Amino acid sequence: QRNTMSKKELEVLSQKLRALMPYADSVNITLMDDVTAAGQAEAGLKQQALPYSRRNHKGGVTFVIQGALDDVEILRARQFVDSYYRTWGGRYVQFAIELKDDWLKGRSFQYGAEGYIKMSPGHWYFPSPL
Amino acid sequence: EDEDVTFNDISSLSKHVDEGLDGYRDYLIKYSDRELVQFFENAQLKRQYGEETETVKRDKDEIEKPSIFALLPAY
What we know:
This is part of a larger assembly, with chains A (130 residues) and B (75 residues).
Chain A: H1 7-20, H2 34-47, E1 53-57, E2 60-67, H3 71-88, E3 93-99, E4 109-110, E5 116-120, E6 123-124
Parallel strand pairs in A: 2-3
Antiparallel strand pairs in A: 1-2, 4-5, 5-6
Chain B: H1 10-31, H2 34-44, H3 68-74
Helix pairs in contact in B: 2-3
PDB class: protein transport
Keywords: T3SS, Injectisome, Needle Complex, Substrate
Entry title: Substrate-engaged type 3 secretion system needle complex from Salmonella enterica typhimurium - SpaR state 2
């Protein structure tokens, strides 16, 4: 989808790659599907049962994995991502992994569009919509 | 000694009296040590079976809350 070239241009590209690689006899160019790539990524995360969020951009997909993961989860995730990267590389799909503590450190809060954080009984923060 | 106001109700009188002791209450709270004061406060109330753990530490302008009957021994 994201490349627009003629057959002649592709051949020229092939020949220039062949000039960069003096040990190769020819370079075969194959067209792959972005939807396939993204789908195999999401299928792998479901198969590993990891919690995640997905974000789409004009030229990429980002999977955000964040929170208090357990050591089994961290092991599985590291193995899966390491396998995927070796197949598809890192240009199109990115995996963001973030260990972090529970949100707002165990204060209580009102999470509507008019939310606020209790600092302590008798003390309101009103920092941002939550 | 000012008779300048006369009192509509229990709470109005009670507050008028209370606000008079603060000159003394200040002097006691200046020199006692708050951790006792709080310990006694929590003790004369029967609260949570008299002593329990606190996960969180949260200070609530405790200077104006504390009863004189709590302040005196600490001093």
